[PDB]
Each structure stands twice: as structure tokens, then as C-alpha cells.
Amino acid sequence: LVEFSKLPEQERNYNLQMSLETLKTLLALGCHVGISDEHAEDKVKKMKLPKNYQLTSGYKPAPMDLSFIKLTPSQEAMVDKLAENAHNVWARDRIR
């Protein structure tokens, strides 16, 4: 719970590693990724959070309004595949 500059370098490194290799495993499983609307962020309205809930660091969170995102059964299965792949990579790292 510290600004990412003072936050541990290895901590943020494995954070962005989880995200990066996570999306890479998505595209490796067979994901088809396409651009639809970059202005969707401005179209959707951010939910209103109190000042205390806002972080003291100063960086501005952008929690998007999860109502319109719908998970198809194919997306649920691909979620399951991604979770299984994450379990496999963590288990392999521990085994080595």
C-alpha cells in the first residue's frame, strides 16, 4: 500500500509479470483480440467513491462500471483455462 516508486521493485516486477504473461497465455491459448472502441473509457462513467476510499498516493484509480461486461460461456471456459495455466506455472516454479 505504497506508491509504486517506493513500492518494492521485485513486488511491482512480479505484478506486471503476472499481468503480462497472463495476457500472453491468453493469446497463446487461442484468444482473438480486436479493437472496438478506444473511446469506451470516456463513454462509460466511473463509479463515485469517497475521498477516504480514494488513495492518498495521488494516482487516480479508474474502476470501470462492470455492469455492461458480460461473460459468455466461451469466456468462462477461457477464464478456467487461464486459471489452470496460472496454477501450472506457479506449481512448476515451486517444483524447480
DSSP string for 25-87: HHHHHT-------TTHHHHSPPPP--TTTS-TT--------TTS----HHHHHHHHHHHHHHH
Reported resolution, Å: 2.9
Discontinuities after residues in the chain (C–N over 2.5 A): none
Asked if 12 and 4 touch (Cβ cutoff 8 Å), the reply is: yes
**Among candidate residues 62, 77, 93, 66, the one with its CA nearest the CA of residue 26:** 77
Specify the experimental method. cryo-EM
